[PDB]
Amino acid sequence: GSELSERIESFVETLKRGGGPRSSEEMARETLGLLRQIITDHRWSNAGELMELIRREGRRMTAAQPSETTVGNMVRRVLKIIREEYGRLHGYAQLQSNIIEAINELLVELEGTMENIAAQALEHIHSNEVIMTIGFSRTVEAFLKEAARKRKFHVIVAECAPFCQGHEMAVNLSKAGIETTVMTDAAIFAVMSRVNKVIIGTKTILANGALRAVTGTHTLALAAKHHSTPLIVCAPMFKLSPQFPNEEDSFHKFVAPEEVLPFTEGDILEKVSVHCPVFDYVPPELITLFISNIGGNAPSYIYRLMSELYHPDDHVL
Amino acid sequence: LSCRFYQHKFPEVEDVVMVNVRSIAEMGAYVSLLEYNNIEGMILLSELSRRRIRSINKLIRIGRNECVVVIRVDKEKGYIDLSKRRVSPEEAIKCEDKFTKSKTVYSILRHVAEVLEYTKDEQLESLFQRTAWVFDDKYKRPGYGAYDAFKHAVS
Amino acid sequence: QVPTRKDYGSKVSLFSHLPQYSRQNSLTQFMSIPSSVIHPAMVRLGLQYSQGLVSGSNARCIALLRALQQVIQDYTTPPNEELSRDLVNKLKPYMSFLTQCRPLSASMHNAIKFLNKEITSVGSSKREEEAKSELRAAIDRYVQEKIVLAAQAISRFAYQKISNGDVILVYGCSSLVSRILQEAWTEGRRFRVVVVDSRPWLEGRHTLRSLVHAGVPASYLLIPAASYVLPEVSKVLLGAHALLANGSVMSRVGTAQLALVARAHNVPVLVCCETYKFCERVQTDAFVSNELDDPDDLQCKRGEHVALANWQNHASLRLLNLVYDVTPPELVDLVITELGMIPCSSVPVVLRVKSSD
Amino acid sequence: KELIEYFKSQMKEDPDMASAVAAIRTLLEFLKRDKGETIQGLRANLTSAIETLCGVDSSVAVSSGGELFLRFISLASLEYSDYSKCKKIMIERGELFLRRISLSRNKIADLCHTFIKDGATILTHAYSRVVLRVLEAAVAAKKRFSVYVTESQPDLSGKKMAKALCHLNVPVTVVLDAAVGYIMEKADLVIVGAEGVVENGGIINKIGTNQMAVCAKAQNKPFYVVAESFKFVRLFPLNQQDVPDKFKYHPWVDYTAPSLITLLFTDLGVLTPSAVSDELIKLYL
């Protein structure tokens, strides 16, 4: 009814203004709850009418923020769930409760993701190890803060220049006692000679195995490929997107340049061009291994998870 | 000091019970029946969902309470087969409300026995049978009848 | 019950979580002579594994399945208990004892998983010995196809690859590569094999004897001199023990090193592995999941001054012999399974068609 | 030999038509003209047909399309028990498969031309209709770019590609075939059309491709390879001699390592090179 469009518009301008909420698993739960509220507050005779409907509001929600892919891939996963149920019921009236219980299964799958990565986390950490991460992500800091329960090693949290969010990760890992080293973003190849492996997170996994992540990590992937150290991308499966990199140049999210060059710099701000991209592109050849809640996967295996979670007819949304 | 929630020690067939997962094995997920004095049950790997499931840990969540329908029970062998596939969201909400009311009645009688200082489990079970299970057998409703009788006795 | 073994020597600081046992140490000093906690076939398997008599992966899995057949044949069912739960509850101390004797191969792990999936799929309406004979026939059919049909298929797929006038490099001891070379020599190909060996197992003499008795001209070499022969070598054949989900090859320790020197000399790598030796478990180095053998195996008698004899007097001295290591997936070219010739990028994908899906 | 005559009549009537689709049409016409109620009797006739099509045409796509067609015949024989309904099932399924294949190139064009930036530089090899279809969809999508086409010495078809692009009124330049490493630093992307894709992700193409691939490797350029799905080959060439020698005859075919290939653009979509082995193992030869 009307309250549905109230909540939809609130979600749309919440995504338009800032990051609401902060982390992504709450946002995926909000998206799945909004989608179950959309499928429980409407009337349809064919599944294709709800399919066109969900495609239209998915277009609206990704037109709210084109840089954040979690809402779009959640809409696409719900679309493939509806397509699978229509295909298994076609070969009618019990479809709605089937999509409801499938969304409930996806919610139980999604709430236990980080702790499944933590359960499989002990298969990648040995004693007295040098780890280097970038940015801030609760999956990687939970990974390290529970992997330090039985192992003793070292984590070097490098800050990122637009928003130094690695200080929060450093003070969260130092409370667990993992001998955290804090550095800048310019010393990575200065310290790549001693880092044994790179365990980072990401924002969005692309269809070809590539990934967008917090900025400055393509440099880290290049240095780790130069030193031949393996890369661990601790990423869930709601950051998996079918959006190809070269697609209408809408890759990077540019923010205000105040954090790079402040407004008190002088009259020299008029004749300067300051850009601040908070995301960066990493090709799959600079990635060794992805770690999802179902296990470890290769970058040569992202197409199979793509075809298992998404449909090629819904890539345009 | 603990006891079961109802006058029966084992649930009936197709009875949705509230359990908590304790461990995960290859045969299924070991659970504990919270309303039957923590007896051991098993949710089958084939009954965890209606969709093809690659691994048991994707939907187990050891430590979380869940409503599961009983498929097979054996009082002699001690085998209790449970299923999360058969339960509906309406039946899950009904089982959640029934477990909440039965847990409130259990906490009330546990506080009453702590005030009476009945450290023995047999005297506490006799108090259970004299307070809640008598009303549950009189009204023919386990959990609903005792909570309704206590809500009427509060007034 | 079974206690935990005393770990021998001074461990490496990077290998503090992995156990390091000894062969002069054994677990049965505080065990019964009629073995009641562990099965007699299981403790016989543990003694055959701990002393190093069965070291090949296929031989370890075959002896494991024979011991499991003797366990199922000597199995009884207690009253008011089902087979499908009591068997998995009784086999887990057996596998814990086998892990305590020696860290298990991945073929043994996949055999444990397949046996658990098979004995989980037994209905309780079936009888006792009927289900026991069904499981024994299932174990027999499983080892039958995924040993001999897989070996014949990989030998047929390698016969159409090895040409005439070729020179082949091998490393370590494997039944599959030796069977490939024997069938290729007997079926018409004329070639010579360069055998690469390494300390302290010296298991290249086994495939050297397998190649000389087949009539193949052989060449015995070590791992530092392989860089001398890789300009000459046209093809490198290797025996894989496990293949991981990223495409890594877990085998004997001189594999990724040998594959890197072979790629540096532009010699292609051909690992030979069966589809049951795959893993959903993945690792990227030889430090987070590896076997540690005896520290007293590295010593040698070069004259009169064996220096690593009393190595435990020096507090700052560490001894280490890695058994398994992994390869980068960009170093190995071929993976020859019974489904055909794949790259490493299809190691989990074949798992997707071997997981009944 | 009416099969080679029908193949040359199907291939010479349209210059916009590939050799593999003509071979599949010839195989379907031979299966419709066989009328032999036998599984092995049809399999041996199809194998002799592909033997004739490989003795006549030395293309890799012809033998590839015949092997896919043979796997399709094996699947349709293993599905249906009786052969009488299976003959009409094979005929209808092959006609529908050819109808799906004949629309593949347009699908490649609309799903492939999205990657090419505006104001960029394209490096391309010898003549094929697929890269022309992708480029004409790119200029139909209002994009401007400078094109550098290899002259491709053994048969001067890259100059014919350049003539077909000057008739399209686009800036194209015949670059020297010994100069693909000279213009690699200005070529931000290298999109190439292939004539056969081997199992691991590598490709079988014309002789001047693989060196350009390593020029794409030392200079970090994304080497895009464009090919349909009927060019998938169940082979594993390790070295440059390990390709079958009947497709060589001055060599004519170079094997390109799958590590030098960034992406594939098939009818399944934009794929990693590891996807070809997935399709070839669920297809089972």
mmCIF file with all atom_site columns, N, CA and C in Angstrom, chain A residues 81 85 88 97-102 104-105 108-112 115-116 293-294 308, chain B residues 48-55 57-64 84-85 87-89:
data_model
loop_
_atom_site.group_PDB
_atom_site.id
_atom_site.type_symbol
_atom_site.label_atom_id
_atom_site.label_alt_id
_atom_site.label_comp_id
_atom_site.label_asym_id
_atom_site.label_entity_id
_atom_site.label_seq_id
_atom_site.pdbx_PDB_ins_code
_atom_site.Cartn_x
_atom_site.Cartn_y
_atom_site.Cartn_z
_atom_site.occupancy
_atom_site.B_iso_or_equiv
_atom_site.pdbx_formal_charge
_atom_site.auth_seq_id
_atom_site.auth_comp_id
_atom_site.auth_asym_id
_atom_site.auth_atom_id
_atom_site.pdbx_PDB_model_num
ATOM 1   N N  . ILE A 1 81  ? 15.532 -16.630 -7.813  1.00 0.00 ? 81  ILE A N  1
ATOM 2   C CA . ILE A 1 81  ? 14.763 -17.531 -6.952  1.00 0.00 ? 81  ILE A CA 1
ATOM 3   C C  . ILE A 1 81  ? 13.330 -17.669 -7.465  1.00 0.00 ? 81  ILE A C  1
ATOM 4   N N  . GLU A 1 85  ? 11.627 -21.083 -9.016  1.00 0.00 ? 85  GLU A N  1
ATOM 5   C CA . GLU A 1 85  ? 10.364 -21.624 -8.516  1.00 0.00 ? 85  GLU A CA 1
ATOM 6   C C  . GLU A 1 85  ? 9.298  -21.680 -9.602  1.00 0.00 ? 85  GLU A C  1
ATOM 7   N N  . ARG A 1 88  ? 10.269 -24.747 -11.678 1.00 0.00 ? 88  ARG A N  1
ATOM 8   C CA . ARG A 1 88  ? 9.967  -26.014 -11.024 1.00 0.00 ? 88  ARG A CA 1
ATOM 9   C C  . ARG A 1 88  ? 8.476  -26.211 -10.774 1.00 0.00 ? 88  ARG A C  1
ATOM 10  N N  . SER A 1 97  ? 4.225  -18.397 -0.836  1.00 0.00 ? 97  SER A N  1
ATOM 11  C CA . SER A 1 97  ? 4.804  -18.965 0.377   1.00 0.00 ? 97  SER A CA 1
ATOM 12  C C  . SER A 1 97  ? 6.131  -19.658 0.098   1.00 0.00 ? 97  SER A C  1
ATOM 13  N N  . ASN A 1 98  ? 6.321  -20.165 -1.126  1.00 0.00 ? 98  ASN A N  1
ATOM 14  C CA . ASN A 1 98  ? 7.609  -20.738 -1.504  1.00 0.00 ? 98  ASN A CA 1
ATOM 15  C C  . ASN A 1 98  ? 8.693  -19.670 -1.596  1.00 0.00 ? 98  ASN A C  1
ATOM 16  N N  . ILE A 1 99  ? 8.357  -18.495 -2.139  1.00 0.00 ? 99  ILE A N  1
ATOM 17  C CA . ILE A 1 99  ? 9.332  -17.407 -2.177  1.00 0.00 ? 99  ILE A CA 1
ATOM 18  C C  . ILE A 1 99  ? 9.572  -16.855 -0.772  1.00 0.00 ? 99  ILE A C  1
ATOM 19  N N  . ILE A 1 100 ? 8.552  -16.893 0.093   1.00 0.00 ? 100 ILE A N  1
ATOM 20  C CA . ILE A 1 100 ? 8.715  -16.458 1.482   1.00 0.00 ? 100 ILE A CA 1
ATOM 21  C C  . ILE A 1 100 ? 9.682  -17.372 2.235   1.00 0.00 ? 100 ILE A C  1
ATOM 22  N N  . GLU A 1 101 ? 9.506  -18.691 2.106   1.00 0.00 ? 101 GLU A N  1
ATOM 23  C CA . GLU A 1 101 ? 10.413 -19.607 2.795   1.00 0.00 ? 101 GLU A CA 1
ATOM 24  C C  . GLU A 1 101 ? 11.795 -19.631 2.143   1.00 0.00 ? 101 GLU A C  1
ATOM 25  N N  . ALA A 1 102 ? 11.885 -19.327 0.843   1.00 0.00 ? 102 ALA A N  1
ATOM 26  C CA . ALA A 1 102 ? 13.196 -19.211 0.207   1.00 0.00 ? 102 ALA A CA 1
ATOM 27  C C  . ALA A 1 102 ? 13.936 -17.964 0.682   1.00 0.00 ? 102 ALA A C  1
ATOM 28  N N  . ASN A 1 104 ? 13.444 -16.648 3.652   1.00 0.00 ? 104 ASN A N  1
ATOM 29  C CA . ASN A 1 104 ? 13.842 -17.003 5.014   1.00 0.00 ? 104 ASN A CA 1
ATOM 30  C C  . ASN A 1 104 ? 15.101 -17.870 5.028   1.00 0.00 ? 104 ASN A C  1
ATOM 31  N N  . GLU A 1 105 ? 15.202 -18.825 4.094   1.00 0.00 ? 105 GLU A N  1
ATOM 32  C CA . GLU A 1 105 ? 16.431 -19.605 3.942   1.00 0.00 ? 105 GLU A CA 1
ATOM 33  C C  . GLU A 1 105 ? 17.612 -18.720 3.560   1.00 0.00 ? 105 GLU A C  1
ATOM 34  N N  . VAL A 1 108 ? 18.700 -16.966 6.807   1.00 0.00 ? 108 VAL A N  1
ATOM 35  C CA . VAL A 1 108 ? 19.512 -17.837 7.667   1.00 0.00 ? 108 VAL A CA 1
ATOM 36  C C  . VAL A 1 108 ? 20.885 -18.095 7.036   1.00 0.00 ? 108 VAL A C  1
ATOM 37  N N  . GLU A 1 109 ? 20.961 -18.162 5.699   1.00 0.00 ? 109 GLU A N  1
ATOM 38  C CA . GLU A 1 109 ? 22.247 -18.264 5.011   1.00 0.00 ? 109 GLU A CA 1
ATOM 39  C C  . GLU A 1 109 ? 23.089 -17.013 5.228   1.00 0.00 ? 109 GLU A C  1
ATOM 40  N N  . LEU A 1 110 ? 22.443 -15.854 5.280   1.00 0.00 ? 110 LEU A N  1
ATOM 41  C CA . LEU A 1 110 ? 23.140 -14.579 5.297   1.00 0.00 ? 110 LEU A CA 1
ATOM 42  C C  . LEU A 1 110 ? 23.543 -14.146 6.701   1.00 0.00 ? 110 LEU A C  1
ATOM 43  N N  . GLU A 1 111 ? 22.811 -14.570 7.734   1.00 0.00 ? 111 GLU A N  1
ATOM 44  C CA . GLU A 1 111 ? 23.180 -14.177 9.090   1.00 0.00 ? 111 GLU A CA 1
ATOM 45  C C  . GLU A 1 111 ? 24.399 -14.953 9.587   1.00 0.00 ? 111 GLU A C  1
ATOM 46  N N  . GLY A 1 112 ? 24.609 -16.165 9.082   1.00 0.00 ? 112 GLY A N  1
ATOM 47  C CA . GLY A 1 112 ? 25.733 -16.975 9.512   1.00 0.00 ? 112 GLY A CA 1
ATOM 48  C C  . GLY A 1 112 ? 26.866 -17.033 8.508   1.00 0.00 ? 112 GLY A C  1
ATOM 49  N N  . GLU A 1 115 ? 30.647 -15.880 10.583  1.00 0.00 ? 115 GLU A N  1
ATOM 50  C CA . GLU A 1 115 ? 31.087 -16.921 11.497  1.00 0.00 ? 115 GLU A CA 1
ATOM 51  C C  . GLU A 1 115 ? 31.418 -18.220 10.768  1.00 0.00 ? 115 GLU A C  1
ATOM 52  N N  . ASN A 1 116 ? 30.876 -18.438 9.565   1.00 0.00 ? 116 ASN A N  1
ATOM 53  C CA . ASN A 1 116 ? 31.322 -19.571 8.757   1.00 0.00 ? 116 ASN A CA 1
ATOM 54  C C  . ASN A 1 116 ? 32.708 -19.320 8.179   1.00 0.00 ? 116 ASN A C  1
ATOM 55  N N  . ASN A 1 293 ? 31.525 -18.043 2.594   1.00 0.00 ? 293 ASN A N  1
ATOM 56  C CA . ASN A 1 293 ? 30.966 -18.867 3.661   1.00 0.00 ? 293 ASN A CA 1
ATOM 57  C C  . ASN A 1 293 ? 30.795 -20.328 3.258   1.00 0.00 ? 293 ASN A C  1
ATOM 58  N N  . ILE A 1 294 ? 30.773 -20.629 1.955   1.00 0.00 ? 294 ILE A N  1
ATOM 59  C CA . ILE A 1 294 ? 30.747 -22.015 1.503   1.00 0.00 ? 294 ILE A CA 1
ATOM 60  C C  . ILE A 1 294 ? 32.139 -22.598 1.299   1.00 0.00 ? 294 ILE A C  1
ATOM 61  N N  . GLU A 1 308 ? 25.344 -19.844 -10.830 1.00 0.00 ? 308 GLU A N  1
ATOM 62  C CA . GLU A 1 308 ? 24.586 -20.523 -9.789  1.00 0.00 ? 308 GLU A CA 1
ATOM 63  C C  . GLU A 1 308 ? 23.756 -19.579 -8.932  1.00 0.00 ? 308 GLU A C  1
ATOM 64  N N  . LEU B 2 48  ? 16.793 -30.310 6.063   1.00 0.00 ? 48  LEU B N  1
ATOM 65  C CA . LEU B 2 48  ? 17.160 -28.963 6.484   1.00 0.00 ? 48  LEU B CA 1
ATOM 66  C C  . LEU B 2 48  ? 16.569 -27.877 5.594   1.00 0.00 ? 48  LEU B C  1
ATOM 67  N N  . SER B 2 49  ? 16.248 -28.191 4.338   1.00 0.00 ? 49  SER B N  1
ATOM 68  C CA . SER B 2 49  ? 15.655 -27.231 3.415   1.00 0.00 ? 49  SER B CA 1
ATOM 69  C C  . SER B 2 49  ? 15.031 -27.971 2.240   1.00 0.00 ? 49  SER B C  1
ATOM 70  N N  . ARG B 2 50  ? 14.280 -27.219 1.438   1.00 0.00 ? 50  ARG B N  1
ATOM 71  C CA . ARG B 2 50  ? 13.623 -27.727 0.241   1.00 0.00 ? 50  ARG B CA 1
ATOM 72  C C  . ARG B 2 50  ? 14.487 -27.539 -0.993  1.00 0.00 ? 50  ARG B C  1
ATOM 73  N N  . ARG B 2 51  ? 15.658 -26.941 -0.824  1.00 0.00 ? 51  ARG B N  1
ATOM 74  C CA . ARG B 2 51  ? 16.596 -26.615 -1.884  1.00 0.00 ? 51  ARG B CA 1
ATOM 75  C C  . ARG B 2 51  ? 17.824 -27.499 -1.738  1.00 0.00 ? 51  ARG B C  1
ATOM 76  N N  . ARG B 2 52  ? 18.546 -27.702 -2.843  1.00 0.00 ? 52  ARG B N  1
ATOM 77  C CA . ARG B 2 52  ? 19.763 -28.513 -2.809  1.00 0.00 ? 52  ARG B CA 1
ATOM 78  C C  . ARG B 2 52  ? 20.761 -27.847 -1.864  1.00 0.00 ? 52  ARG B C  1
ATOM 79  N N  . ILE B 2 53  ? 21.222 -28.567 -0.843  1.00 0.00 ? 53  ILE B N  1
ATOM 80  C CA . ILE B 2 53  ? 22.129 -27.988 0.146   1.00 0.00 ? 53  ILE B CA 1
ATOM 81  C C  . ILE B 2 53  ? 23.505 -28.630 0.029   1.00 0.00 ? 53  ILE B C  1
ATOM 82  N N  . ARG B 2 54  ? 24.500 -27.816 -0.340  1.00 0.00 ? 54  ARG B N  1
ATOM 83  C CA . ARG B 2 54  ? 25.864 -28.316 -0.479  1.00 0.00 ? 54  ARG B CA 1
ATOM 84  C C  . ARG B 2 54  ? 26.498 -28.671 0.866   1.00 0.00 ? 54  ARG B C  1
ATOM 85  N N  . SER B 2 55  ? 26.300 -27.841 1.894   1.00 0.00 ? 55  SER B N  1
ATOM 86  C CA . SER B 2 55  ? 26.938 -28.068 3.188   1.00 0.00 ? 55  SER B CA 1
ATOM 87  C C  . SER B 2 55  ? 25.933 -27.849 4.312   1.00 0.00 ? 55  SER B C  1
ATOM 88  N N  . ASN B 2 57  ? 26.603 -26.551 7.346   1.00 0.00 ? 57  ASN B N  1
ATOM 89  C CA . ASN B 2 57  ? 26.858 -25.353 8.139   1.00 0.00 ? 57  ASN B CA 1
ATOM 90  C C  . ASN B 2 57  ? 26.323 -24.069 7.513   1.00 0.00 ? 57  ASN B C  1
ATOM 91  N N  . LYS B 2 58  ? 25.761 -24.124 6.305   1.00 0.00 ? 58  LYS B N  1
ATOM 92  C CA . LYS B 2 58  ? 25.210 -22.922 5.691   1.00 0.00 ? 58  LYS B CA 1
ATOM 93  C C  . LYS B 2 58  ? 23.890 -22.492 6.319   1.00 0.00 ? 58  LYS B C  1
ATOM 94  N N  . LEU B 2 59  ? 23.150 -23.417 6.937   1.00 0.00 ? 59  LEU B N  1
ATOM 95  C CA . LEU B 2 59  ? 21.872 -23.073 7.547   1.00 0.00 ? 59  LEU B CA 1
ATOM 96  C C  . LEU B 2 59  ? 21.689 -23.692 8.928   1.00 0.00 ? 59  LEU B C  1
ATOM 97  N N  . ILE B 2 60  ? 22.752 -24.191 9.555   1.00 0.00 ? 60  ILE B N  1
ATOM 98  C CA . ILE B 2 60  ? 22.618 -24.839 10.858  1.00 0.00 ? 60  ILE B CA 1
ATOM 99  C C  . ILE B 2 60  ? 22.519 -23.804 11.970  1.00 0.00 ? 60  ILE B C  1
ATOM 100 N N  . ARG B 2 61  ? 23.560 -22.970 12.110  1.00 0.00 ? 61  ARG B N  1
ATOM 101 C CA . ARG B 2 61  ? 23.687 -21.924 13.135  1.00 0.00 ? 61  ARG B CA 1
ATOM 102 C C  . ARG B 2 61  ? 23.586 -22.520 14.544  1.00 0.00 ? 61  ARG B C  1
ATOM 103 N N  . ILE B 2 62  ? 24.637 -23.271 14.888  1.00 0.00 ? 62  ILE B N  1
ATOM 104 C CA . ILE B 2 62  ? 24.785 -23.862 16.218  1.00 0.00 ? 62  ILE B CA 1
ATOM 105 C C  . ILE B 2 62  ? 24.777 -22.770 17.280  1.00 0.00 ? 62  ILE B C  1
ATOM 106 N N  . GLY B 2 63  ? 23.804 -22.837 18.185  1.00 0.00 ? 63  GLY B N  1
ATOM 107 C CA . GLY B 2 63  ? 23.570 -21.796 19.164  1.00 0.00 ? 63  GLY B CA 1
ATOM 108 C C  . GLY B 2 63  ? 22.276 -21.036 18.974  1.00 0.00 ? 63  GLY B C  1
ATOM 109 N N  . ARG B 2 64  ? 21.556 -21.275 17.883  1.00 0.00 ? 64  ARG B N  1
ATOM 110 C CA . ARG B 2 64  ? 20.314 -20.580 17.583  1.00 0.00 ? 64  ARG B CA 1
ATOM 111 C C  . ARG B 2 64  ? 19.125 -21.506 17.803  1.00 0.00 ? 64  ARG B C  1
ATOM 112 N N  . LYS B 2 84  ? 13.286 -29.340 9.607   1.00 0.00 ? 84  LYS B N  1
ATOM 113 C CA . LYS B 2 84  ? 13.005 -27.925 9.419   1.00 0.00 ? 84  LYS B CA 1
ATOM 114 C C  . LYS B 2 84  ? 12.293 -27.655 8.101   1.00 0.00 ? 84  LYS B C  1
ATOM 115 N N  . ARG B 2 85  ? 12.260 -28.637 7.198   1.00 0.00 ? 85  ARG B N  1
ATOM 116 C CA . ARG B 2 85  ? 11.608 -28.454 5.908   1.00 0.00 ? 85  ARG B CA 1
ATOM 117 C C  . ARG B 2 85  ? 10.087 -28.463 6.034   1.00 0.00 ? 85  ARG B C  1
ATOM 118 N N  . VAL B 2 87  ? 8.078  -27.494 8.526   1.00 0.00 ? 87  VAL B N  1
ATOM 119 C CA . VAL B 2 87  ? 7.428  -26.464 9.330   1.00 0.00 ? 87  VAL B CA 1
ATOM 120 C C  . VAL B 2 87  ? 7.146  -25.239 8.465   1.00 0.00 ? 87  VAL B C  1
ATOM 121 N N  . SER B 2 88  ? 6.000  -24.604 8.714   1.00 0.00 ? 88  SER B N  1
ATOM 122 C CA . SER B 2 88  ? 5.552  -23.380 8.074   1.00 0.00 ? 88  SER B CA 1
ATOM 123 C C  . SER B 2 88  ? 5.894  -22.179 8.946   1.00 0.00 ? 88  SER B C  1
ATOM 124 N N  . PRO B 2 89  ? 5.935  -20.965 8.375   1.00 0.00 ? 89  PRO B N  1
ATOM 125 C CA . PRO B 2 89  ? 6.149  -19.772 9.219   1.00 0.00 ? 89  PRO B CA 1
ATOM 126 C C  . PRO B 2 89  ? 5.038  -19.519 10.226  1.00 0.00 ? 89  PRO B C  1
#
